[PDB]
Design a binder for these strands. Structure first.
Lengths: 70, 122, 180, 139, 73
RNA sequence: UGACGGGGAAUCAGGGUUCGAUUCCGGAGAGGGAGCCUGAGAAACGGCUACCACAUCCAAGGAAGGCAGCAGGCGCGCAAAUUACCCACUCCCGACCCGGGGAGGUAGUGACGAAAAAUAACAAUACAGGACUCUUUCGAGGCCCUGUAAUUGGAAUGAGUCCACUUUAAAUCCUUUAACGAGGAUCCAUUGGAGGGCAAGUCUGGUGCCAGCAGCCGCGGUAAUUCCAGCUCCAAUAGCGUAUAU
């Protein structure tokens, strides 16, 4: 259902993003998962705006502190 | 390993001898109280379960340990005069566990009834 | 209603002018000489000398045969000759005020382990004390600020459980002496 | 010349009791009208709800547009104007948020180069602006 | 076959990542793409390690730093 | 009156000034007010009688209320802890060595504060200094010391895991001790600062009276000693920064 979906709505993109999240997190314990996800994040954020990218980079940054907090 | 006994008071009212134990054990851990009772009972010509010790504090640095110990005349004077937690450390005694909160709820529920019903309201 | 004591006091006084270069210079010289860790360890010795000098500065305005002067001056000078910062002949109350701040830093256990030859530098003396090596007449002392009065200044030895004392060498060498 | 005799303690103390009121800190802190007109009521901070976001220009030798917020306080309902301190810390605020507003540092007088503003914002929605600003927490 | 893929190898995961990249980039012109990708990045990096998340953040911020470089001049 | 009084507290040269609800004493009150029973002792509220006010159950005939006791939740707030264990202690009550006590003791949350105190030490080699008996200068010595270098080295040890003891009503924590536990000792100390006041840049990149810093004076209009970053440093140091009373 991931390949067949063509979401244009907000809730359709949320359902598409949830289906993509469920597919990606099944292979989260792979040793090659860290390099693959970093390559995938670099590819998909290249078309994003500078404001969206710096928001996304800050989203990773404080969560890394949250790993030190938890 | 080495027992020294500081200030000694023989107590004719509660039928015992009162002393402060010094234990030198310079290469060892804190010695058990059973070994202290065996050494002091070998010292004072008496049997080892009429003598009761408590409160041993090991000093800082690995040195001596200093506490109290009292040597009774007989076991029946020990069963009259010694505290029940200190007899229960020896297996001579055991307490019935409810202990305080179920007793209090049974005390405030036995106030609600009258007559012979206080026995058959738990 | 509790069975407690809340009695405590602070034992240093923070300086008023915080960034005067002469004060920073002299106290950093005392830190680097005497192997203290931070400036609060200097200010605490300034507070105990200030309390001693306030006691003598209070007693010195009295008539010299008032018995508070004759009792408490003898007790205060006896404690200063007992810890060694005032020498045995000059027990007069005017010689309390000639105490410099380097008297109480010489009588610490860290400086008296470095001056009695038990360490190779003063920082080696503090790290030797803090690792439970130094004992004072069969009491193992873990305090680097132990002020050694002179009936304990004679007995400063290595511990009976230390590798530089009696024996049982540490985990580094005994892991190192297992090669096969 | 003062009244300096020996039985004149009442004239001296009922003089200095009355000429203490011409001292401004004693009058401002002991008459009681300052505590009723102050929007905090003697607190250190106050929680309040952002009404509207403003910009105010600096006083005459400076040239800037200082970013501030108009807060309405929960505690007594008065409305204040508070300044959201650091660079880019205007953008972390939605309207109708709880902010915790502290004084500006000069205890009732409103100066800086910003006119008529003596309050500044410490928190927004129980996260502080230092943690939001450095990238240590998120919204 | 994104849903039918079960990659265990490094090259199989690269082909799975390439198929995922081609699917995601078709909706890049949508106005909800930025919120959806940020939610997807947050979900996928919640299981990542402290060393792994720092490398992902550094790669995007240097790209963000390179985007500020090219747009300005 | 954001007033319980006092013993007292924080500052302090002498004088003062301010604070004291708070663990001891003395007073007052148990939602607001009254009025009483018993008793040696009460205007008792872990007693009663009403009125006011607010609330629970109801078969709508009636019944019962009071945490400013310990814990706990609501609410107000900037602002305050666990519905734990026990009579071992310290004492009180009782007809009583014997029963009882959220009085108290003990643990838990706890950077309000206060005392102690880790975060490396030493020896090499190389380089640089220092003073040198030798050396008008090049150049010396472990024929002497001082510092540095993520350049080596084997000695010490607790953080911590954790058999036991010991403590203690029964556990815990501290102390003693057995086995593990250090190279970059990644077992990686922070908070504010570098124009003056005030110890510390006359550095490199961005912005170009915009963004902002700035307690005060002031900096910002394309060589910013002040913004935003990096490097270096410098106070304080297991802490320091900000806001208000003082």
């Amino acid at each position: 259902g991931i390949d067949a979906m063509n979401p244009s709505s907000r809730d359709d993109f949320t359902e598409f993003g949830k289906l993509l999240k469920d597919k990606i997190t099944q292979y989260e314990k792979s040793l090659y998962y860290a390099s693959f996800l970093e390559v995938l994040v670099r590819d998909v954020c290249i078309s994003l705006e500078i404001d969206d990218l710096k928001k996304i980079t800050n989203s990773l940054t404080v969560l890394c502190s949250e790993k030190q907090k938890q | 390993v080495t027992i020294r006994t500081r200030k000694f008071m023989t107590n004719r009212l509660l039928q015992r001898k009162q002393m402060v134990i010094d234990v030198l054990h310079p290469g060892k851990a804190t010695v058990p109280k059973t070994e202290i009772r065996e050494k002091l009972a070998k010292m004072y010509k008496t049997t080892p379960d009429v003598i009761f010790v408590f409160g041993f504090r090991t000093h800082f640095g690995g040195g001596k340990t200093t506490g109290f110990g009292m040597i009774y005349d007989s076991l029946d004077y020990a069963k009259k005069n010694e505290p029940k937690h200190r007899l229960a450390r020896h297996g001579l005694y055991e307490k019935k566990k409810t202990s305080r909160k179920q007793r209090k709820e049974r005390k405030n529920r036995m106030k609600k009834v009258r007559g012979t019903a206080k026995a058959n309201v738990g | 209603p509790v069975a407690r004591s809340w009695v405590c006091r602070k034992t240093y006084v923070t300086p008023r002018r915080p960034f005067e270069k002469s004060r920073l210079d002299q106290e950093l010289k005392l830190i680097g000489e005497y192997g203290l860790r931070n400036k609060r360890e200097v200010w605490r010795v300034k507070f105990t000398l200030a309390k001693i000098r306030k006691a003598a500065r209070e007693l010195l305005t009295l008539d010299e045969k008032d018995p508070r002067r004759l009792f408490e001056g003898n007790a205060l000078l006896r404690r200063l000759v007992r810890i060694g910062v005032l020498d045995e002949g000059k027990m007069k109350l005017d010689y309390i005020l000639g105490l410099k701040i380097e008297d109480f830093l010489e009588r610490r256990l860290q400086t008296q382990v470095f001056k009695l030859g038990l360490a190779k530098s003063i920082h080696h003396a503090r790290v030797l004390i803090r690792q439970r090596h130094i004992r004072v007449r069969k009491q193992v002392v873990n305090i680097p600020s132990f002020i050694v009065r002179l009936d304990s200044q004679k007995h400063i030895d290595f511990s009976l459980r230390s590798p530089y004392g009696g024996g049982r060498p540490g985990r580094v060498k005994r892991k190192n002496a297992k090669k096969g | 010349g003062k009244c300096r005799g020996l039985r004149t303690a009442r004239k001296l103390r009922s003089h200095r009791r009355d000429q203490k009121w011409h001292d401004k800190q004693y009058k401002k802190a002991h008459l009681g009208t300052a505590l009723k007109a102050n929007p905090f009521g003697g607190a250190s901070h106050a929680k309040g709800i952002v009404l509207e976001k403003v910009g105010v220009e600096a006083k005459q030798p400076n040239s800037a547009i200082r970013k501030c917020v108009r807060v309405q306080l929960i505690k007594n309902g008065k409305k204040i104007t508070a300044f959201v301190p650091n660079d880019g810390c205007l953008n972390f605020i939605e309207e109708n948020d709880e902010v915790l507003v502290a004084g500006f540092g000069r205890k009732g007088h409103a100066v800086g180069d910003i006119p008529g503003v003596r309050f500044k914002v410490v928190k927004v929605a129980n996260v502080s602006l230092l943690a939001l600003y450095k990238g240590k927490k998120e919204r």
